[PDB]
Amino acid sequence: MAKSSFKQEHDLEKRRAEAARIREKYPDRIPVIVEKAEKSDIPTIDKKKYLVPADLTVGQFVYVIRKRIKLSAEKAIFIFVDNVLPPAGALMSSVYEEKKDDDGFLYVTYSGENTFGFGSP
Template identity: 60%
Template sequence: MKWVYKEENPFEKRRAEGEKIRRKYPDRIPVIVEKAPKSRLRDLDKKKYLVPSDLTVGQFYFLIRKRIHLRPEDALFFFVNNVIPQTMTTMGQLYQVWFIYYLLLLYY
């Protein structure tokens, strides 16, 4: 999958932005959410989020579902490095595993 954010922002810029955010908000996780190229879901009004590290992936699903006005019968999946994270995983745990990007990148 192609990341528009990664293509538009070189690694050094992403790293600096992620480090700055983590210094200022150590208990928060910077998250970038992008729509997958073939997704038929609505666009999000924003793609950058700053979430509590103890927020679960399931709670984040709920937050995003509300933002795109998704019906209960419609499916929503997040991918982190082509893997669907478990809903009980916290955003902090995901960040620890995938922090090499300095910002947690999710596809929906």
């Protein structure tokens, strides 16, 4: 209902392994799986999945998306997961190991705001 991707393509072995493999490896980079929300209207960003360092926060991950993906000036991005709205400033890292975790891999879903929805080509 909230996100849509991994639920269609399950592969814990991959998530679990890559998760513990990285935390054991050294980089300790936050595995972020960006996915388009159901009511998402912010298309352009190559979401899919990619490992992002834990040396940053939630809003930093947002800063990663940097709302430069055909986004508007005064506007920005917004993430929804499991019907939530992360602290966007906390710390995807600590957070990853303090509240939200499934194995070590982090799954997120992006969504925009009053970005694009007027006239399409």
